[PDB]
């Protein structure tokens, strides 16, 4: 990660020191007033809502380095009530007030850029899944997961695709059950030493082609490897 | 919108002049190996994706103002293969190449800002919706079709909310539920898509004040 390292070492030079969090903190919760810009480095997070009656809907996850936002950077106003939850045992993360990461960007446009391009992808990765999703149904769309999975996590190994994740964070319904299942028969995948394995990753690559074309664009180095 | 009019006088005082399309004109297809910037001033289009084997899918609508960038800023490279089709009547648009963009920007950052800011609107619009769909599978999808829609071109009346646009721009199980709701009301739509009104409510408070 070249971006992400001297996008750390700025903020560091800017005098904002990293922090850990651990399970079931928030990073930020629905009810902060201040609008943050949070840099989580390393670990992996969720942003979550709660619906009127309590109910916890986990809508995006994200997997250090990456940018989180809070507040709109030209009127400073909230994008929206959610929640930033780690999943991810303990992770470091910035956090960098909405209005001071209005300043450090305009002092410094490289940096500018790269926050810039990461809501880019972001952007694009939705109308890619989508994609993927209007053509196959959820055939295309679980493929997709498995397919996103699988190129940050895939480790080439002599006997299938060895998949770097915990057991349970990693499938954290019949529908989903009965792909799987055609999945596990036609060797595509396997659950083997209680860990998904993928041994024709081409089949996930061609149900979900433009979330695969995604991962080309915005991740080459990503996406070469195991290619 | 006074960012846009403002990005608008903006950009032609440093040489980029407006073009006016016809529906179903692409501004730009999937194909093309440049990658722009369209600051779609007027006018709605759609950005379309068409399969390998013909099939046309829609992704995404936009109206203007808004910014739509089929590069990425810096390294320049496509963020994906897209086709932006006009469905309006006619719309107006200035076409940018992306590596001019960054200069321009990069010298206003006030403008920075504006189209950061339209990029950030449309991620927490999809992460808004999908908090609906996961809640409301295809209806809170659907409903929060129909209330942005009326929000955008609302206008309060006794006889009830109305949008004023032709059958023109208009166009299974999804017109069997639009009939399953036909059979029973600003407020359903707002029932099972809230967090899609609580997005229009933060990004577009002044015109989600409408009916409110």
């Not at 990765?125 to 397919?147: E, V």
Request: hydrophobic residues 35%; charged residues 20%.
């Amino acid at each position: 990660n070249a971006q992400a390292e001297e996008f750390k070492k700025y903020l560091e030079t800017n005098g904002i020191k990293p922090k850990q969090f651990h399970k079931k903190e928030l990073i930020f919760n629905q009810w902060d007033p201040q609008e943050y810009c949070i840099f989580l480095y390393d670990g992996i997070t969720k942003l979550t809502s709660i619906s009127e009656n309590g109910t916890i809907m986990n809508l995006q996850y994200y997997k250090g380095a990456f940018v989180i936002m809070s507040g709109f950077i030209d009127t400073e106003t909230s994008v929206g009530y959610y929640n930033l939850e780690v999943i991810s045992e303990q992770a470091t993360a910035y956090v960098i007030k909405i209005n001071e990461l209005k300043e450090l960007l305009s002092k410094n446009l490289t940096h500018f850029f790269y926050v810039f391009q990461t809501l880019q992808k972001q952007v694009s990765y939705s109308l890619a899944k989508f994609n993927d999703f209007s053509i196959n149904g959820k055939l295309g769309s679980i493929c997709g997961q498995l397919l996103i999975l699988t190129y940050v996590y895939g480790k080439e190994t002599p006997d299938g695709i060895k998949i770097t994740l915990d057991n349970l964070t990693m499938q954290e319904s019949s529908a989903v059950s009965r792909i799987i299942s055609k999945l596990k028969q036609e060797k595509v995948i396997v659950y083997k030493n209680s860990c998904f394995y993928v041994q024709n990753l081409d089949y996930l690559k061609r149900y979900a082609p433009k979330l695969d074309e995604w991962f080309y664009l915005a991740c080459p180095a990503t996406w070469g490897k195991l290619n």
